[PDB]
């Protein structure tokens, strides 16, 4: 289980794996962690899988409510702001949810990190999950603020490759989601294993 996303001038790229396991035993290799909220809003998953589903769908309702209310297409910062509130109600009752908030608004391609306790953090580069520590190293070697969309995916691919390689709990197949002004697009679903021979030799 590894979830990473990072903000840059061209929008945000979301890169996660497909494998969510219970204990040492793998539950399903093809699990889809990334959750859809709105055409311009994209959710993530970490920790408990059901806590990410429910609350982001409840937020998806809240995103529709205000949009069915003032029709203003609520900002990305207010999304995680509404998410922080609802999570702080049950804080201490055992809810553990990692996640990220991706979207585009008048301010830009906003990126926000939400913790179980309601911590709301914007920023350029994030990561989370079990094996997230292996992602920071390879991702932080070299950086260009303005990313070429192709090599940007390669920087996202090579990250997930070696990340899931060292971690036993990170694996399955690659999931990649680019962010755009109007709406996000899913780049590819690609096996991790066959990407090695490229980097290996």
């Amino acid at each position: 289980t590894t979830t990473l996303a990072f903000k840059f001038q061209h929008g945000v790229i979301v890169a996660v794996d497909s494998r969510a396991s219970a204990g040492n035993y793998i539950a399903t290799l093809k699990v889809n962690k990334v959750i859809e909220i709105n055409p311009y809003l994209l959710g993530t998953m970490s920790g408990c899988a059901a806590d990410c589903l429910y609350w982001e769908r409840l937020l998806a309702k809240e995103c529709r409510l205000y949009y069915l209310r003032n029709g203003e297409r609520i900002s990305v910062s207010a999304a995680s702001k509404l998410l922080s509130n609802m999570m702080c109600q049950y804080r201490g009752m055992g809810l553990s949810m990692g996640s990220m908030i991706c979207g585009w608004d008048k301010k830009g391609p906003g990126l926000y990190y939400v913790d179980e306790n309601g911590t709301r953090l914007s920023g350029n580069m994030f990561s989370t999950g079990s094996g997230n520590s292996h992602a920071y190293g390879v991702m932080d070697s070299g950086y260009r603020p303005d990313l070429s969309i192709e090599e940007a995916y390669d920087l996202g691919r090579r990250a997930i490759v070696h990340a899931t390689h060292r971690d036993s709990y990170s694996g399955g197949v690659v999931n990649m989601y680019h962010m755009k002004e109007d709406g996000w697009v899913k780049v590819e679903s690609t096996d991790v294993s066959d990407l090695m021979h490229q980097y290996r030799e």
Binding site: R57, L58, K61, R64, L65, L68, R69
Partner: protein
């Protein structure tokens, strides 16, 4: 004043509710349309002054992508009902992950309308009935559906129903013009003809509001583009 809300008449009627249906005769004239190709609703804005903005006042709002609205009489009474109607509509998709059918929309509104009461209840309950005549249209997998609702709270599937002050002669006129398979564009024609005839003011894009729902096209609010076209294409 020397009478109750629930007091029965010697003819078997409620003093309260009878004046409700009697109160809606002062509302704005609006007509719904159900066609084989979609659902069409029109409403007269009834602007009392140029300083009053007709764009801010909306008597047709979007609950779901399928379902529209209509308003007559006291405007805020409808806004109170549409608020909870939009909450339960998203509560539907929050559970079943699907759009609420047009029938289930009126069932939730009929329940909220029937709860009217005073004693033996909480202060957060509505004491008197609404002076609004409701028209709820929409299109789903079952096809186009248009329902009529009065202060009584009933909902019945009907092709067209007239509300407001002109509903007397309009509903009989909607019967004559609308028949068989008549579609959207042909419905807007006879719609704006009957409405312009009954209302005092002449037809204008800013004097009325029009919106339609189709199987392939969800609820679409007509802007100055579509409004100025249909009034000159009448």
């Amino acid at each position: 004043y020397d009478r109750g809300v629930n007091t029965f008449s010697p003819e078997g009627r409620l003093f309260q509710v009878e004046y409700a249906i009697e109160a809606i005769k002062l509302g704005s004239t609006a007509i719904g349309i159900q066609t084989s190709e979609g659902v069409c609703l029109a409403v007269e804005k009834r602007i009392t002054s140029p300083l009053m903005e007709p764009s801010s006042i909306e008597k047709i709002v979007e609950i779901d992508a399928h379902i529209g609205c209509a308003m007559s009489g006291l405007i805020a009474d409808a806004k109170t009902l549409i608020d909870k109607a939009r909450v339960e509509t998203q509560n539907h998709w929050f559970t079943y992950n699907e759009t609420m059918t047009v029938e289930s929309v009126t069932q939730a509104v009929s329940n909220l309308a029937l709860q009217f009461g005073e004693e033996d209840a909480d202060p957060g309950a509505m004491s008197r009935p609404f002076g609004v005549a409701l028209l709820f249209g929409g299109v789903d997998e079952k096809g186009p559906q248009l329902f009529h609702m009065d202060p009584s709270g009933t909902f019945v599937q009907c092709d067209a129903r007239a509300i407001g002050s002109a509903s007397e002669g309009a509903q009989s006129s909607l019967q004559e013009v609308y028949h068989k398979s008549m579609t959207l564009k042909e419905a807007i024609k006879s719609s704006l003809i009957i409405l312009k005839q009954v209302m005092e003011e002449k037809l204008n894009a800013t004097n009325i509001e029009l919106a339609t729902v189709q199987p392939g096209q969800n609820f679409h609010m007509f802007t100055k583009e579509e409004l100025e076209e249909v009034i000159k294409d009448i």
